[PDB]
Write a protein that binds this ligand. Structure first.
Ligand SMILES: OC[C@H]1O[C@H](O[C@H]2[C@H](O)[C@@H](O)[C@@H](O[C@H]3[C@H](O)[C@@H](O)[C@@H](O[C@H]4[C@H](O)[C@@H](O)[C@@H](O[C@H]5[C@H](O)[C@@H](O)[C@@H](O[C@H]6[C@H](O)[C@@H](O)[C@H](O)O[C@@H]6CO)O[C@@H]5CO)O[C@@H]4CO)O[C@@H]3CO)O[C@@H]2CO)[C@H](O)[C@@H](O)[C@@H]1O
Ligand SMILES: OC[C@H]1O[C@H](O[C@H]2[C@H](O)[C@@H](O)[C@@H](O[C@H]3[C@H](O)[C@@H](O)[C@@H](O[C@H]4[C@H](O)[C@@H](O)[C@@H](O[C@H]5[C@H](O)[C@@H](O)[C@@H](O[C@H]6[C@H](O)[C@@H](O)[C@H](O)O[C@@H]6CO)O[C@@H]5CO)O[C@@H]4CO)O[C@@H]3CO)O[C@@H]2CO)[C@H](O)[C@@H](O)[C@@H]1O
Ligand SMILES: [Ca+2]
Ligand SMILES: [Ca+2]
Lengths: 585, 585
């Protein structure tokens, strides 16, 4: 075996508790190098002559180059020291501990997980595990009150082609009027892009954090929305824009006016005074030269105090969580304290960070509960949309991503197909509905929480910002109702099958030539196998009956009954068809 | 190129800032696999049309299986995305990024270090880097006041054999009396084990955190000690026992008397009432069944404020830092807040955690400045004391350990040979002074902060606790004055050669056959090469002139001049001899 390929660390995503007395440990090795991985462990103060406890680590996954083994250690003392015993195909064995590798156990040393503090066990809101999120970009969802429309509003039509400065009149009253639709779809939570006072259509350049934007409504209307959504079983998630403010933010205007004499100058990153001349900003902003968005110095206790108050105010209005804008450019201390504040006010309030890359640094349990899973989007884009990768590469990317974070984070990642910052997924699929649907079926059955971008469910299309922000299509005749009913069925099944929301996930089959991919979701005695024929050709495949699942399966999408023949299942898939096989338990 | 052996993560010790605009990045590959490692980077919002910046990563080290490449990225924007370009021996070129490996750069993706916040740049007290610490176990150092001696105090003699419950009368007045001695040795800081009220001789079972133990003195005496040490250029570090209290601690006494009625019952981990009764404890304690040490629930905000108050009190007395007892069993939040409290009170107060294993989780910059480096001791024991490993594995263990933490931590790690919890190092060497001295020579020249265990400098020996806590030997005739003078010279040298305190470290030469180990310390134009002949036979060797060090060298220990012919130095080392070759700059 290739020892240079073996990896483990007593922290992060390779060692973490799932309870106050149980520790999950993972180990990585070159694919095929290790057939048996066992963990020998004991209390960190156990005597030299005490027997070590044993825990066998099953193979939890494999990507292109590695195998990932996982075990559960029962640590009643909450203190554990442990070593791995790795066995190869030829029976060659070796111990792997903190000191290194050795045939002699004592020489390998022991990894140590010092202490398991209850306060450090990653815990997330129970409801977030089985939620189906629907993203609403207010200015474009529904114009329920044209009397608050901004001047110059354009026509709310299917042929609308938004500009960076277009307005259509979307508002909160509209959202309220359309709740019956959202409820019928099966949505359980709504994520809103900024809704606080701001001059733009997107409103990421905040003028006033404590006020609902006039064109969207007022506090009484917001409160009504929260109540109407809640009694319909729908939660509310707001967009927290704490990385930067708008240039109309009071503190910033003060600096613009008083400059060096401003009591708020240290609330930002001003390069020199006066504050500006044009787009040539002499102050740090979001991205590059974005005059309307001066970066906030969240490291300043005054700024942190202010934003924390903003958070308190809105949570008082009854919201259920936050979506953190550009979360990765706000300091960690801020986020650790934010989590403490939020959870103290509402233990069930969800915290989702908006980060597009590897977000492990914010997903260990003391900061966010989840993140906008763009890694998931990329793999889904490449596999179902552009066809840039095949099923085996898809399986690998998913597996590698799953191993990036502790299971508590993975279980609730917001798996989106697109957002208000990307082209519509149907457009990514070049308008191919068959491909789009397969992606959706995957999104609705995979490990994580699905996030639906408004309109995708009724066939909307579009290029990237601002063309992805076109007015919602409400005209029944202009909506893809077949797709809508498709979504409804998938969402109902998700709520219907426990393994789909709370089950683990394991690869079942991945064939690069047939481009068929299958995985199994498991919890308790229930097993649900999802098979995706990601090819424009009808195919048949023989899959091994999933580990301890039973001999009778039912494709919940068709009512088709399939029996295990000599430990196998014969499946015939039409082009781009997906099956959701329930083992009946 | 074995891709399965290549590793990098955009955080931890593989990617971290050394300043507000500079990110240090490290990458490891199978030893020999990569000949050139380059980093191509840019601002995270740079246009796809902009050209990437270039940074060549030199080989910063190599262990038994890997090569470690290190580079410095200039990030004026404080936001960076990057990809590695690795070239094999044959000229093979592969790109490595967050997405994976590929001959095509774009397909490799890019790692991202979202933002560099000034508050997250690991910063340590400037003085700690060039310090030489002396550890004082007060009950056994010096009895300056015989009137405060504990009951049954035993004879202060060289033939003393301490028992777990012995007392010899050591106190703070004695330390004050021996300051001229400590100053002569050249020590710059004193690390004291517990000195607060406690009934034991070690005092890790705290009765009163706010009072000097009567056997050791009183507050005024402590203050005088602080002042007398300070005026002699000696700082003071106290032992903070925050993981557990003594069973005579006021809060615990209360729980013992009032039980479930006690307002302090949640300050501990009580399983049932009434509490205690012999060694069969019904409450969690340090280690296993240690009735005198009930664990403190530092997660409890009341417990945390009390301890923080304890820390504020002693810092008001003028101390310079803390040594955190069993730091790995106290929660991370407590430690993050502790650091902010401490640093706000005294920016130069040092925080050293007592952790015996990989302490990377506490050394990223938001918790401890350093730790008692027991990993260093293990390597030193195996190589110099037991001879269990040869020069090449020694070099490997050292390099591997060095790569475990960011450079800010490594530079000030407390490198000890032994402690009040281990057998004396001389005893580890089986009484061999030649091996002992070579280890000390290594300790005084290697990267990190040397920690001297009281008595080792004058030849004390002893088995592990309690035998390693023998009363100090003060009678000159019973002291190894030759050793003492050796220590003095090495300490002076360390203070005189900037590279020994502020320089980096790189392997120079390691040969298992001759068991010769050499490394070089470098800062600016100063290069100091250390050659250790760890064998009991006179030997001669040839070493390539230290990279860009120059051609004139001087062994500071003897005054011997070495010129080096054709880029090589000819060295003749006596048995267990060591050389400290200064390049003259
Ligand atoms: O010409 C300037 C610009 O102006 C307008 O943009 C404004 C926008 O309309 C408005 O809504 C707002 O934008 C906010 C946005 O809505 C929020 O969701 C958020 O979005 C920003 C992200 O938070 C931020 O991280 C970044 O995103 C970049 C990723 O970080 C980066 O990783 C990369 O993504 C790639 C991944 O790295 C890779 O792993 C994966 O495979 O591929 C990804 C790319 O496909 O690149 C991302 C894009 O830079 O920027 C996001 C903003 O776009 O915060 C925003 C700010 O509040 O304000 C905007 C500024 O005024 C126009 O609409 C826009 O077209 C125009 O470019
Ligand atoms: O039966 C009674 C008991 O009495 C004595 O113990 C008491 C001791 O005399 C007294 O001073 C005090 O002890 C404290 C000690 O002085 C402090 O420094 C500290 O020490 C404890 C450590 O903090 C704690 O982590 C642990 O140490 C363990 C290491 O974590 C663990 O890694 C492992 O160490 C190995 C290293 O990893 C490796 O690098 C090296 O090569 O080999 C090591 C050996 O395995 O094991 C360590 C031992 O478990 O315990 C330390 C305590 O010894 O905190 C202490 C508590 O405040 O109180 C003691 C209890 O009353 C005797 O000394 C003891 O033998 C006897 O059993
Ligand atoms: Ca309107
Ligand atoms: Ca005394």
């Amino acid at each position: 075996m290739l020892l240079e390929a073996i990896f483990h660390e007593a922290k992060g995503s390779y060692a973490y508790p799932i309870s106050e007395t149980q520790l999950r440990v993972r180990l990585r090795a070159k694919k095929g190098d290790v057939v048996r991985c066992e963990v020998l462990y004991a209390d960190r103060y156990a005597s030299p002559e005490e027997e070590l406890a044993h825990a066998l680590a099953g193979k939890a996954g494999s990507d292109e180059r590695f195998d990932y083994f996982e075990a559960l250690l029962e640590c009643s003392t909450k203190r554990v020291k442990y070593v791995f015993l790795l066995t190869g195909p030829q029976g060659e064995a070796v111990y792997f501990g903190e000191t290194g590798f050795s045939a002699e156990r004592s020489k390998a040393g022991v990894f140590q997980y010092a202490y398991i503090h209850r306060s450090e066990v990653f815990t997330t809101p129970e409801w977030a595990k089985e939620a189906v999120i629907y993203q609403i970009f207010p200015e474009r969802f529904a114009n329920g009150d044209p009397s608050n429309d901004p001047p110059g509003t354009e026509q709310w039509a299917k042929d609308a082609r938004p500009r960076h400065d277009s307005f259509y009149g979307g508002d909160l009253k509209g959202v309220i009027d359309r709740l019956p639709y959202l409820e019928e779809l099966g949505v359980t939570a709504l994520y809103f892009t900024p809704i606080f006072a701001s001059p733009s259509h997107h409103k990421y350049d905040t003028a006033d954090y404590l006020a609902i934007d006039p064109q969207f409504g007022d506090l009484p209307t917001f409160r009504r929305l929260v109540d109407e959504a809640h009694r319909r079983g729908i939660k509310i998630i707001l967009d927290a824009v704490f990385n930067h403010a708008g240039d109309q933010f009071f503190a910033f205007r003060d600096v613009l006016q008083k400059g060096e004499q401003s009591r708020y100058k240290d609330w930002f990153f001003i390069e020199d005074f006066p504050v500006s001349k044009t787009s040539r900003t002499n102050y740090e902003t979001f991205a590059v030269q974005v005059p309307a968005m001066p970066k906030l110095r969240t490291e300043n206790p005054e700024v942190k105090e202010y934003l924390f108050d903003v958070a308190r105010f809105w949570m008082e209005q009854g919201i259920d969580g936050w979506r953190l804008n550009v979360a990765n450019e706000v300091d960690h201390a801020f986020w650790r304290e934010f989590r403490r504040l939020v959870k103290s006010l509402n233990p069930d309030a969800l915290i989702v960070g908006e980060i597009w890359h590897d977000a492990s640094g914010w997903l260990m349990g003391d900061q966010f509960d989840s993140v906008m899973n763009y890694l998931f989007r990329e793999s889904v884009i490449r596999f179902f949309a552009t066809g840039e990768i095949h099923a085996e590469r898809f399986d690998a990317e998913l597996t590698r991503a799953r191993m990036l974070y502790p299971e508590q984070a993975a279980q609730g990642l917001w798996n989106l197909l697109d957002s208000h910052d990307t082209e519509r997924f149907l457009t990514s699929c070049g308008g191919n509905e068959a491909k789009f649907r397969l992606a959706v079926l995957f999104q609705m059955t995979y490990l994580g929480t699905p996030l639906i971008y408004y309109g995708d469910e009724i066939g909307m299309a579009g290029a990237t910002d601002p063309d992805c922000r076109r007015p919602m299509i409400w005209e029944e005749k202009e909506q893809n109702r077949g797709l809508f009913e498709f979504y409804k069925e998938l969402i109902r099944l998700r709520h219907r099958l426990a393994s789909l929301t709370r089950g683990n996930v394991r690869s079942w089959h991945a064939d690069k030539q047939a481009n068929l991919y299958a995985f199994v979701r498991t919890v308790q005695d229930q097993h649900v196998g999802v098979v995706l024929n990601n090819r424009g050709e009808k195919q048949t495949v023989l899959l091994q009956v999933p580990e301890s699942g039973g001999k009778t399966w039912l494709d919940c999408l068709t009512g088709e009954e399939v029996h295990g023949k000599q430990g196998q299942l014969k499946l015939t898939l039409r082009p781009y068809q997906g099956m959701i096989l329930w083992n009946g338990r």
